[PDB]
Amino acid sequence: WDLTVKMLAGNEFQVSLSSSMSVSELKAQITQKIGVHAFQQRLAVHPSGVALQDRVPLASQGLGPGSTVLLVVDKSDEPLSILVRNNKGRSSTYEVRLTQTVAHLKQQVSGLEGVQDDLFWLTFEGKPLEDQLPLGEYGLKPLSTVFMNLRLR
Amino acid sequence: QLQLVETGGGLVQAGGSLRLSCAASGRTFAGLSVKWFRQPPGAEREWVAHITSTGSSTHYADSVKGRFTISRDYDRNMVYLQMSSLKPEDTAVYYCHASTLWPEKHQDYWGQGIQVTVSS
Question: Which of A75, A133, B45, B52 has its CA 20 to 30 A from that of B92?
């Protein structure tokens, strides 16, 4: 499948899906093209103009070979507060931007818990957070709880 | 560079009020996330309050919610902790703390730490 992406400001590029044909593959290609994370891509099917739903087959939302989607990028970087439960079980808020890395969150927690950053690890909904990836790739929300655990040695 | 200067501590009777202050003396508080912590006698340092960098959220630990108020006077580089209905259990050394925010390089700043003794 070759789809057209039309950025609202006006410019057009083309992506190829050949793997899964999901919203993920599409967004991955747009990342390769214009360097913005999946969570920053607001996509809509043309011509209806409705949103593309994440976690739904593209062919289910009326998208086939040669169709075009409309792309708005929303750097989704307005600060929000999240909860961090630490390894002693106590919770406190932390101000973050979904555009920051997990590594940057670990630096904030390191500074306040007094533990070197490589001596602990973080999880959201049980999924271990990778240092290089932005918080928004994990779907964090106002007052989500990241759990901290020690890499006890 | 930034230093955080704390004032306002001291001795209060149970049921009284205190306004702690945290002056931003190096640069302004712009773009910094600011928290108060306290350390009760022979206890872990515990989190108390939080005002975010845009000054538009506040968060409190359960032990102080309803009694304590965090706020900022932005024109004057000030973050306050308003403590009312103080109990003897609020006796602790109080610290204010500031964090930068992505995409700024992460740094932590800490006030010196002031004593609050609540007496009955």
Answer: B52
